[PDB]
Design a protein around this motif. Structure first.
Motif, PDB file in Angstrom:
ATOM      1  N   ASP A 148       0.851  -1.188   0.000  1.00 31.30           N
ATOM      2  CA  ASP A 148       0.000   0.000   0.000  1.00 31.30           C
ATOM      3  C   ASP A 148       0.888   1.240   0.000  1.00 31.30           C
ATOM      4  O   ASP A 148       1.510   1.563   1.015  1.00 31.30           O
ATOM      5  CB  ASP A 148      -0.935  -0.014   1.207  1.00 31.30           C
ATOM      6  N   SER A 149       0.950   1.934  -1.135  1.00 33.18           N
ATOM      7  CA  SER A 149       1.778   3.134  -1.275  1.00 33.18           C
ATOM      8  C   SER A 149       0.875   4.365  -1.234  1.00 33.18           C
ATOM      9  O   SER A 149       0.460   4.889  -2.268  1.00 33.18           O
ATOM     10  CB  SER A 149       2.590   3.084  -2.564  1.00 33.18           C
ATOM     11  N   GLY A 150       0.574   4.827  -0.024  1.00 33.73           N
ATOM     12  CA  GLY A 150      -0.155   6.061   0.164  1.00 33.73           C
ATOM     13  C   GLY A 150       0.725   7.284  -0.034  1.00 33.73           C
ATOM     14  O   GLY A 150       1.847   7.215  -0.538  1.00 33.73           O
ATOM     15  N   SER A 185      -0.819  -1.577  -4.508  1.00 34.12           N
ATOM     16  CA  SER A 185      -2.000  -0.723  -4.495  1.00 34.12           C
ATOM     17  C   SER A 185      -1.614   0.693  -4.088  1.00 34.12           C
ATOM     18  O   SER A 185      -0.666   0.899  -3.323  1.00 34.12           O
ATOM     19  CB  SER A 185      -3.075  -1.267  -3.539  1.00 34.12           C
ATOM     20  N   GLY A 186      -2.353   1.661  -4.610  1.00 29.78           N
ATOM     21  CA  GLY A 186      -2.162   3.064  -4.289  1.00 29.78           C
ATOM     22  C   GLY A 186      -2.215   3.932  -5.535  1.00 29.78           C
ATOM     23  O   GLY A 186      -2.131   3.458  -6.666  1.00 29.78           O
TER      24      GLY A 186
HETATM   25 MG   LIG Z   1      -2.215   3.774  -0.794  1.00 33.87          MG
END
Ligand SMILES: [Mg+2]
Ligand SMILES: Nc1ncnc2c1ncn2[C@@H]1O[C@H](COP(=O)(O)OP(=O)(O)O)[C@@H](O)[C@H]1O
Lengths: 57, 375, 63
Positions: free
Chosen positions: B154-156, B300-301
């Motif tokens: 998860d790359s926020g 995701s992100g």
């Molecule tokens: Mg993300």
């Protein structure tokens, strides 16, 4: 166009999917030649046992 | 508002807020998490003179407002800011009243438990939502992929999280958070552009340079060889047309900016690249399933819209891990909405209303009930 | 079970792709027809302004 983006995506991804099903099949094929190898090894050892059987007889 | 009492689905992602109704395919109101405040005081009259500015209004009024982030890497500054932005989203953007619709929310991985208790309490007192549920974005992205096995990256915009989940089971013992995210990317690009002759500090240029990252940036296949061939690189060097009209040309920087996540030593992190963080995460858990983790990795992100993460990912993992089994990444287009889609998926089934967090449970046990009601 | 439902919705969006094309194509055709009528509008306006400038010249020497 965004539609073009999606088009290339579904086409390329289905291409990779098909190739990948090809290689998973190929992995099953490899395990199949493996099973064949063990079966042939057992057959040859059994032939040796039978010939020794006849000699002992 | 729909005639039916269907639930609200809101992804408060670290960088973007995406809200809408349950049963919908995409969130209706999607806005970045920037918040603008009047840079000066009031003397004029006849128009404006409003404190909080959120959404596209603040995007249009970026120059006149001090642009502040109510959340950064999960940390909460001022709950009043969330109060106002949620008011705006529900009434001015979603045109919905939270009285008649339970809310499903998604939270950043490993968010503070005290943060959850305070946010839930202020929420329940301030708002009149009938029922509640909050979930980690990791399982939401899993649901969007619809495969119970895999490791989620998860790359926020504040944190990058690596979380392994095997057969729909969370593995907190092998979950890690890395402080590299969009903020770092913009910072590093800012200093490189400063070394290119253009030195800006304000947030408008921050958004301009993140747009540049969205459009032109590369992920280098080989790093030092590509700067060596990028010495001149008339064709490889790429230009952008800034809204003022000046043409700003960038060469190796296109693939020298995302590289910092892979090579943190550029600006001084003890932690190695994010591929090392996925690698260690994998080995922490039992050996056997590790191969499946290799073959089932998901990313995701919003950042994932950039090219180059997939090829780099697979090549480096194959370099680190034995190359017998084939590693392949999966990433559906427009996956930044995927979490919200999973929220709709949660509301799709009829078992979801068995564990709505109703008002009376919170009134009985206070916020503490969530400690027993979610986990 | 949830995943097949996603496979289906994407399919819905996929065919919707052409539906996204339709509004763009009508807008394109509207631009088409507007430019085509602007052709003759520009020509007639040029003729009208030539006549107007002729009247300007005659009033110029008349004074
Ligand atoms: Mg993300
Ligand atoms: N269309 C896009 N193309 C490329 N990058 C994008 C796009 N939209 C958003 N981003 C990037 O995504 C970041 C926000 O990430 P976000 O999706 O909010 O993380 P999370 O999945 O944790 O919510 C922003 O900093 C922005 O740079």
């Amino acid at each position: 166009m965004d539609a073009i983006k999606k088009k290339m995506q579904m086409l390329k991804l289905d291409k990779e999917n098909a190739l990948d099903r090809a290689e998973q099949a190929e992995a099953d094929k490899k395990a199949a030649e493996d099973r064949s190898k063990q079966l042939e090894d057992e057959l040859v050892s059994l032939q040796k046992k039978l010939k020794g059987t006849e000699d002992e007889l | 508002d729909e005639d039916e009492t269907t639930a609200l689905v809101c992804d408060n992602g670290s960088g973007l807020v995406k809200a809408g109704f349950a049963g919908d395919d995409a969130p209706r109101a999607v806005f970045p998490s920037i918040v603008g405040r009047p840079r000066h005081q009031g003397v004029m009259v006849g128009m404006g003179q409003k404190d909080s500015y959120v959404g596209d209004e603040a995007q249009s009024k970026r120059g006149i407002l001090t642009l502040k982030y109510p959340i950064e890497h999960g940390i909460i500054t001022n709950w009043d800011d969330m109060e106002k932005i949620w008011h705006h989203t529900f009434y001015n953007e979603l045109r919905v009243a939270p009285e008649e619709h339970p809310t499903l929310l998604t939270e950043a991985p490993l968010n503070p438990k005290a943060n959850r208790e305070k946010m839930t309490q202020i929420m329940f007192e301030t708002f009149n939502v009938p029922a509640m549920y909050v979930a980690i974005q990791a399982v939401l992205s899993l649901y969007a992929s619809g495969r119970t096995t895999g490791i989620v990256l998860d790359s926020g915009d504040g944190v990058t999280h690596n979380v392994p989940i095997y057969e729909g089971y969370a593995l907190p013992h092998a979950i890690m958070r890395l402080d590299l995210a969009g903020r770092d990317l913009t910072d590093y690009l800012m200093k490189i552009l400063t070394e290119r002759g253009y030195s800006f500090v304000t947030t408008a240029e921050r958004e301009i340079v993140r747009d540049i990252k969205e459009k032109l940036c590369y992920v280098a296949l080989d790093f030092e060889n590509e700067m060596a061939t990028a010495a001149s690189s008339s064709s490889l060097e790429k230009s952008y047309e800034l809204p003022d009209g000046q043409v700003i040309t960038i060469g190796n920087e296109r693939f020298r900016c995302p590289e910092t996540l892979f090579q943190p030593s550029f600006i001084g992190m003890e932690s190695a690249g994010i591929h090392e963080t996925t690698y260690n995460s994998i080995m922490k858990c039992d050996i056997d399933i590790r191969k499946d983790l290799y073959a089932n990795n998901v990313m995701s992100g919003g950042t994932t819209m950039y090219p180059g993460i997939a090829d780099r990912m697979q090549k480096e993992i194959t370099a680190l891990a034995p190359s017998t089994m084939k590693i392949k990444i999966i990433a559906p287009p427009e996956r930044k909405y995927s979490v919200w889609i999973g929220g709709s998926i949660l509301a799709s089934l009829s078992t979801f209303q068995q564990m709505w967090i109703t008002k009376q449970e919170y009134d009985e046990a206070g916020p503490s009930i969530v400690h027993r009601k979610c986990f | 079970d949830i995943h097949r439902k996603r496979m289906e919705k994407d399919l819905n969006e996929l065919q919707a792709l052409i539906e996204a094309h339709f509004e763009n194509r009508k807008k394109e055709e509207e631009e088409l027809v507007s430019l085509k009528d602007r052709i003759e509008r520009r020509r007639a306006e040029r003729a009208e302004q030539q006549r107007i400038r002729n009247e300007r010249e005659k009033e110029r020497q008349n004074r």
